[PDB]
Design a protein around this ligand. Structure first.
Ligand SMILES: [Mg+2]
Ligand SMILES: [Zn+2]
Ligand SMILES: [Zn+2]
Ligand SMILES: [Zn+2]
Lengths: 551, 270, 112, 107, 171, 177, 97, 84
RNA sequence: UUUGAGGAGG
DNA sequence: CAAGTAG
DNA sequence: TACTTGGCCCTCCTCAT
């Protein structure tokens, strides 16, 4: 998939290691300095300034270039960029923990607030469950607010032993908007905790301290919950939308970057100029803002950071949030090709396991068959047949990874097939397909039928296979999926085939029977009172396709 | 939810129901390792019925003029009357059927004897019936040894688990126990010869089939049981189109959420 | 004895409707809810907090929030979860792919 | 084993885990008026020797975690007085196959 | 200096070749994709030893196309120069910047200023060469060099070597 | 590529790749302690010229053999006897091997798999590390200064007199031409 | 047509392993990307021509794999990364079990 | 780890998923121009040939059954009893 | 083209 | 509309 | 105390910025 051969080896993912970015790595990785906030126009001249999107990142305008990476548009995943902030910012989502962390370690020296010495502590440390240690470590010392320099060892509460020092009182902390404040207690002292400081108190936290608290020296050191260097997603993550040429189409994201960028430069241009000391932290909260917003936008501290037009603004997190979004809406469920839908109707002349497929669709849906000595003949006939008569095909693809469009190609009628080539042909009678009716809550809501090319526009299904999908013909529509690999088919025909689903495991009993007319009529036909004469008893016999020809 | 909550659960090649962590959730799928599809409501005759009827149906005494098998049924009838070494196997069979009795009446206090079990024995014999055109007139030809010794030999092959040790080979007897009771129930000498006049041939067949039909009723390591079970429950939930207590759809919600303040707290004390 | 209850109760919620569910299903659920230790709810509060992989519980309710604390605590995912693979585009260890298939070159000579 | 009537002083109770190896357990009168194990619903559980357990594991290829657990404060867990690590075999009736054997480790 | 390291390679075989003599095509293709290869991590892969007992193990079938993939465990003779190692070869080329000696499948170059002083360079010589008080180095003349450094590259490895030390030079 | 019998847990920070020098510090891929397919441990494989020339010819030849088990259904003199064995059992486009055989056949120091046997048995009573135990086998050496200088890793691992004797017994076994 | 979650759940029930994969990949997303053998990222600078590979910052050219995943997932990742979270992709397990 | 051909423990029979997948796989291959190990009594459909190759147990494939703990068991189409 | 709202279908 | 979870 | 996220599936229109 994708096209173009790669000498790289091919493996399947086996592990997913989650980590946090070390400002250093974000750099290493990046290919764009990303200094300007604007998009392109080298003074209106169309291209892209070595500023935002493409100062080497991916590209647009159907052009190979991509730091020689060429490949152009399709085949080239984006290439991350970075953007040196001016001052350290929180991380919308981690703030909660960055907070809890502090309540877990005092500043000035930055070290735990309960060593092997305290016993209640010990137990908390045995719990081999980062999630639960941290959740019990915190509970134990969110309370103690004095960096004890001496504690009664395992002997006499009389003899005092020493460890680390600087008892500097520990301030209780609370969350105000996007910042943390704490009092240091007659009467308190309220000062705002500067990122620049917090960060510093984390860098200093001990390696076995990371560890003791739910962390990991290699992939996630607390000192990374605070953003220094910012990863700048390449185009394919925030593409455009060009209404031809001389117009716009930038993606929502491409904006917050722009804003985060603006709000960054302005900050910096104050520390190397008339720096009105505490008239800066009034524009530093703007960077903390934007950079927070660009990721999360549905917060408690109201301000939604509305985009000109009052339109909310799509925070990255938004994209992933359940249903309709990435995870659930794109990966756990996608739209798919080789599918079709119409209105079902009953038909007492179709084996249980069949399905009437309207010629229309059969000519539309296709199956990729591999040119083989077994079929060459039959296949070449379908190919010559063109994509208009029914039994035919509509695409021939040769080993040379290039598709021949059967309806145009000046050689449409020509073509000798080559053992190995593939000929996408029409769906034919007896092509196993996965049929179904939503809502799907049964193994049975989906079953494999034998395709039956038929006239008129509907999926004509047998009656007895009705109740399983649980459907009637009152305008009820249905879905059909066409397999693609000899083995795919097999899977449908070998486990999804309707004749298999006859006995329901969800109630250890059959889940299909005889209903309506055939049911009603079978009773009438039964009755001792009911007798049938020759002429008819003969026609009836002829109808059971397996009649032994014995009146 | 039910679904997301059980996706990852499937029967593993060891015949254990685990998830993606491999945490055993059931040691044998459904406490019996049977594929739901191969199960039908059979009846455990060994349960219901007066202690009286129980004797007149399964008791065989070769040391008694009125409690021995009328030689009109067994070929070697008359020549068995009295044989002591047989009455030991005959007594063994009976002491068992009885143990079964007390066993079943200990797992199903209701007295309900109709339950879902693999291998439909009632039919598996019926077919044996007209398959060998068996005439209720002439006598069978099954040694008493033929029967009771073969029945024991069948149980040996109804393997659900395989294991080369005790813990496992012990679980075996467990996961099978119930079925067997139904087996001994239907293959008790008196029945086999007086109710369904099997011939050695018919018998050796009915046996051969139960064994094979059973081995087929076992669950397949792979079966994505969780989702199955999930659906199997949330499906009948949508079909819920709705003596005075919290009940139905809302009840189910109450249950899954593991709620503390159920509308109906109630409590039955006997 | 609790499992007994939980099940007995669930059963009755399907019985009151004249429906039938083969033990095993309700048992399995009653069991999943019980094993871990006591009553684990079929909610983002219970089951979706257990040791399961991140990507998995991530495809249900707490999504982004769940992920965040994953890279934060450098979580590691097995990719033994149906979901995991579905997200990855790899055949999941389910039925068909609950085992491997190989060409025994040896037997591949006795066949000629 | 100590049977209090209405309750013990929290000053008191904080003296049980202070003389190992030995061990102590506290039970309320009103909690022992009826033996719970006698209940229609409670199936019989059984302690497993450090051996019988090491066997079980090795016989299912199980890691300790993967085993269904029982609360250290679970009613029955005190009726037998388990310990964080001891495994219990629970043999109960089953409407699918007469008897089903399940195990419960202790947390 | 030369080695006999134990390696393994991965070949993905198309169903087509799932014949009777597969072991054959496998081995054979193994050879086409190893003998003549060069890695910085393994140096020069020169020859596959014990051709006959190459381990194939069972190959598994991938899962979208019948292709099967085998983890062929072999063993062979390799050779990768090092800094500080000393080997002697046959000079090949020679210029106003030095001469290049050829040690085995590789080629090591010697800078005019990395060799002794009393050794000038003769331009008007045919073939080109370097002259000394008593020594004369040209095309075929056999030298013995000390590899000062190595530079891996593509499907080959080069290195610069000095003959300014003692016990080095011609022979 | 071609995986090497040993999966090092490269946990992100792939930084520390020391230098390569006759300090006997060869890329981790050549620790004097490596692993054999059988899963056992096994000393590195020190192959000195002419000892290799034999090994190569050994398989290259025995290949020509098993190569025809499936076909039924003096200096300048060996330069030719080999150019043939190649154009039969080699990739032909392995111009590296051609050159390897020349170099390995011109500069080689032995002809008999016997003589080469003694070379080995002799040098293998040292306790010396494979690399040395090879450089010693393929490099002429008259004085111990010449040796312990053209193989600096020797220096303190053997008295000059000793290493001298050994050098004496080399030129003594050094097959003629 | 959309192959919603439910549809997936059914296929899982069936054990339609391969079919499911297929619906999800070949018949929709399916994309080929390159990873670093070191930091399980999509950094890799695959020039798929002059066979060049690299992935500086980790600096490679030798240890590089190629994988097939849903373009959506590709995105999922990149998106996560832009949020400063690293989803490592490793082609082999080291945690055993 | 690997499990001996002896001491083997799984089902002597073939799981439907195995059967299903092997016929699928084998079919894919036959359809890929792989070699066919039976006399096509004139058959021309791969999954049909696979069906035959499987009835004469002339399928060169081997099922590696993995266990929850990681160790597996290897079985050949030959061995595996094909009830169904 | 994306998006956001309303109406409808089983 | 609610219940639970968590600060 | 207060608030937070959960809210059938799929499909089809039209409208407006
Ligand atoms: Mg309707
Ligand atoms: Zn690019
Ligand atoms: Zn301090
Ligand atoms: Zn990298």
């Amino acid at each position: 998939v994708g096209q173009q051969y790669s000498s790289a080896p091919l493996r399947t993912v086996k592990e997913v290691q989650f980590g946090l970015f070390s400002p250093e790595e974000v750099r290493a990785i990046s290919v764009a300095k990303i200094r300007f906030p604007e998009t392109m126009d080298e003074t209106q001249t169309r291209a892209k300034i070595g500023g935002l999107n493409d100062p080497r990142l991916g590209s647009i305008d159907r052009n190979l270039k991509c730091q020689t990476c060429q490949e152009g548009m399709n085949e080239c995943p984006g290439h991350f960029g970075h953007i040196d902030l001016a001052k350290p910012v929180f991380h919308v989502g981690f703030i909660a923990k960055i907070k809890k962390v502090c309540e877990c370690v005092c500043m000035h020296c930055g070290k735990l607030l309960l060593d092997e010495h305290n016993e209640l502590m010990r137990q908390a440390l045995a719990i081999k469950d980062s999630k639960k240690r941290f959740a019990a470590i915190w509970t134990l010392c969110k309370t103690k607010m004095v960096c004890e320099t001496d504690v009664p060892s395992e002997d006499d509460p009389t003899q005092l032993v020493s460890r680390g020092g600087c008892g500097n009182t520990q301030p209780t902390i609370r969350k105000d908007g996007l910042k943390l404040v704490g009092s240091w207690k007659d009467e308190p002292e309220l000062r705002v905790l500067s990122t620049e400081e917090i960060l510093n108190i984390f860098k200093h936290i001990s390696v076995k301290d990371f560890t003791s608290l739910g962390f990991n020296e290699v992939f996630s050191r607390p000192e990374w919950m605070i953003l220094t260097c910012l990863p700048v997603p390449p185009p394919p993550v925030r593409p455009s939308i060009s209404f031809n040429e001389s117009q716009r189409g930038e993606d929502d994201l491409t904006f917050k970057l722009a804003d985060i960028l603006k709000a960054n430069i302005s900050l910096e241009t104050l520390e190397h100029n008339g720096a009105p000391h505490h008239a800066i932290e009034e524009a530093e909260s703007l960077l903390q803002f934007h950079v927070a917003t660009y990721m999360d936008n549905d917060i408690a501290g109201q301000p939604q950071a509305l985009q000109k037009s009052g339109r909310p603004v799509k925070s990255i997190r938004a994209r992933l949030k359940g249903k309709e979004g990435r995870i659930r809406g794109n990966l756990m469920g996608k739209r798919v090709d080789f599918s079709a839908r119409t209105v079902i109707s009953g038909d007492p002349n179709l084996e249980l396991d069949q399905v009437g497929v309207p010629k229309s669709i059969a000519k539309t849906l296709t199956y990729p068959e591999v040119v083989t000595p077994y079929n060459i003949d039959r296949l070449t006939q379908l190919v010559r047949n063109g994509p208009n008569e029914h039994p035919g095909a509509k695409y021939v693809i040769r080993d040379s990874g290039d598709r021949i469009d059967l309806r145009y190609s000046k050689r449409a009628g020509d073509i000798q097939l080559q053992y190995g080539w593939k000929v996408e042909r029409h769906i034919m009678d007896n092509d196993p397909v996965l049929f179904n009716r939503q809502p799907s809550l049964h193994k049975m809501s989906m079953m494999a039928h034998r395709v039956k090319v038929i006239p008129y526009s509907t999926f004509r299904l047998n009656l007895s296979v009705t109740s399983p999908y649980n459907a009637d013909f009152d305008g009820d529509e249905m879905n059909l999926h066409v397999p693609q690999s000899e083995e795919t088919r097999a899977e449908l025909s070998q486990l999804c085939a309707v004749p298999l689903q006859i006995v329901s495991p969800q109630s250890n009993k059959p889940c299909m029977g005889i209903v309506q007319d055939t049911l009603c009529g079978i009773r009438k036909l039964t009755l001792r009172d009911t007798f049938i004469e020759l002429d008819q008893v003969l026609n009836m016999l002829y109808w059971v396709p397996d009649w032994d020809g014995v009146i | 939810r039910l679904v997301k909550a059980l996706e990852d659960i499937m029967v593993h090649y060891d015949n254990t129901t685990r998830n993606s962590l491999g945490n055993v959730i059931q040691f044998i799928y459904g406490e019996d390792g049977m594929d739901a599809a191969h199960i039908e409501k059979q009846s455990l005759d060994t349960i219901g019925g007066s202690d009286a009827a129980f004797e007149k149906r399964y008791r065989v005494d070769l040391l008694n003029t009125d409690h021995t098998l009328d030689p009109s049924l067994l070929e070697s009838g008359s020549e068995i009357l009295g044989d002591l070494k047989l009455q030991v196997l005959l007594d063994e069979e009976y002491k068992q059927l009885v143990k079964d009795r007390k066993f079943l009446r200990e797992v199903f206090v209701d007295g309900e004897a109709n339950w879902p079990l693999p291998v439909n024995i009632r039919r598996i014999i019926q077919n044996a019936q007209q398959t060998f055109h068996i005439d209720h007139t002439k006598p069978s030809d099954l040694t008493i040894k033929d029967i009771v010794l073969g029945v024991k030999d069948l149980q040996e092959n109804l393997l659900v688990l395989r294991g080369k040790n005790e813990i496992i080979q012990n679980a075996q007897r467990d996961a099978v126990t119930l079925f067997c009771c139904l087996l001994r129930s239907r293959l008790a000498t008196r029945r086999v010869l007086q109710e369904y006049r099997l011939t050695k041939q018919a018998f050796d067949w009915v046996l051969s089939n139960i064994e094979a039909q059973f081995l087929r009723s076992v669950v397949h390591p792979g079966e994505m049981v969780g989702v199955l079970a999930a659906q199997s429950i949330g499906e009948p939930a949508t079909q819920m189109t709705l003596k005075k207590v919290t009940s139905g759809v809302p009840r189910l919600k109450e249950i899954l959420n593991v709620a503390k303040n159920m509308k109906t707290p109630s409590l039955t004390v006997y | 004895a609790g499992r007994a209850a939980l099940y007995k109760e669930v059963y009755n919620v399907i019985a009151s409707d004249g429906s039938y569910v083969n033990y095993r299903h309700m048992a399995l659920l009653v069991d999943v809810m019980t094993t871990q230790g006591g009553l684990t709810s079929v909610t983002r509060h219970g089951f979706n907090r257990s040791n399961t992989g991140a990507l998995m519980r991530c495809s249900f309710e707490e999504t982004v929030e769940i992920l965040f604390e994953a890279g934060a605590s450098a979580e590691l995912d097995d990719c033994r979860g149906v979901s995991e693979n579905v997200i990855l585009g790899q055949m999941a260890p389910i039925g068909t792919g609950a085992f491997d298939v190989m060409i025994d070159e040896e037997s591949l000579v006795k066949y000629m | 084993i100590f049977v209090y009537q209405n309750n013990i002083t929290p000053s008191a109770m904080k003296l049980v885990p202070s003389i190992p190896p030995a061990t102590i357990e506290t039970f309320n009168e009103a909690a022992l008026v009826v033996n719970i194990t006698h209940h229609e619903l409670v199936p019989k559980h059984i302690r497993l020797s450090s051996d019988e357990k090491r066997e079980l594991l090795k016989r299912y290829r199980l890691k300790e975690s993967q085993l269904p657990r029982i609360q250290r404060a679970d009613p029955v867990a005190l009726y037998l007085g388990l310990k964080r690590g001891e495994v219990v075999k629970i043999i109960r009736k089953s409407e699918t196959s007469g008897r089903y054997a399940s195990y419960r480790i202790c947390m | 200096m030369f080695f006999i390291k134990d390696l393994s390679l991965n070949i993905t075989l198309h169903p087509s070749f799932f014949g009777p003599r597969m072991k054959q095509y496998l081995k054979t293709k193994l050879l086409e994709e190893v003998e003549g290869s060069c890695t910085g991590k393994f140096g020069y892969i020169l020859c596959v030893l014990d051709y006959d007992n190459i381990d194939i193990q069972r190959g598994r079938i991938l899962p979208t196309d019948g292709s099967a993939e085998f983890n062929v465990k072999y063993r062979a003779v390799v050779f990768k120069p090092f800094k500080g190692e000393v080997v002697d070869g046959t000079v090949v080329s020679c210029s106003q910047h030095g001469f290049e000696v050829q040690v085995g499948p590789m080629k090591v170059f010697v800078t005019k200023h990395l060799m002794p002083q009393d050794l000038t360079f003769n331009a008007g010589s045919n073939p080109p060469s370097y002259q000394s008080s008593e020594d004369v180095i040209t095309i075929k003349s056999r030298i013995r060099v000390k590899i000062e450094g190595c530079i891996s590259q593509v499907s080959s490895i080069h290195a610069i070597g000095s003959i300014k030390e003692d016990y080095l030079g011609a022979i | 590529s071609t995986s090497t019998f040993q999966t090092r847990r490269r946990r992100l920070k792939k930084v520390e790749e020391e230098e390569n020098a006759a300090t006997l510090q060869l890329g981790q891929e050549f620790q004097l302690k490596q692993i054999n397919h059988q899963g056992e441990e096994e000393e590195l494989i020190a192959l000195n010229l002419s000892e290799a020339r034999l090994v190569i010819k050994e398989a290259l030849v025995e290949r020509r053999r098993a190569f025809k088990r499936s076909q039924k259904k003096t200096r300048e003199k060996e330069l030719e006897s080999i150019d043939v064995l190649l154009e039969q059992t080699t990739g032909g486009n392995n111009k590296d091997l051609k050159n390897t055989m020349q170099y390995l056949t011109n500069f080689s120091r032995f002809r008999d798999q016997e003589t080469v046997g003694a070379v080995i048995q002799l040098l293998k009573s040292t306790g010396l590390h494979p690399f040395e135990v090879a450089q010693l086998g393929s490099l002429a050496c008259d004085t111990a200064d010449e040796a312990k200088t053209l193989i600096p890793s020797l220096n303190n691992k053997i008295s000059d007199d000793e290493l001298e004797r050994i050098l004496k017994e080399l030129s003594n076994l050094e097959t003629l031409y | 047509l959309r192959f919603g979650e439910m549809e997936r759940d059914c296929m899982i029930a069936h054990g339609a392993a391969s079919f499911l994969k297929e619906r999800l990949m070949e018949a929709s997303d399916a994309f080929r990307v390159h990873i670093c053998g070191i930091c399980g990222l999509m950094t890799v600078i695959a020039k798929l021509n002059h066979n060049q590979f690299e992935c500086k910052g980790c600096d490679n050219k030798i240890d590089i794999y190629q994988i097939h995943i849903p373009y959506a997932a590709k995105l999922l990742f990149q998106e996560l990364m832009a949020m400063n979270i690293t989803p490592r992709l490793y082609t082999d397990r080291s945690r055993d079990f | 780890k690997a499990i001996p051909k002896d001491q083997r423990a799984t089902t002597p029979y073939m799981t439907k998923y195995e059967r299903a997948r092997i016929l699928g796989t084998r079919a894919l291959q036959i359809s890929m121009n792989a070699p066919v190990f039976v006399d096509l009594e004139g058959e021309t459909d791969p999954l049909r040939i696979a069906m035959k190759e499987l009835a004469e147990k002339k399928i060169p494939l081997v099922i590696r059954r993995y266990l929850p703990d990681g160790s597996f068991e290897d079985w050949s189409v030959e061995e595996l009893i094909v009830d169904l």
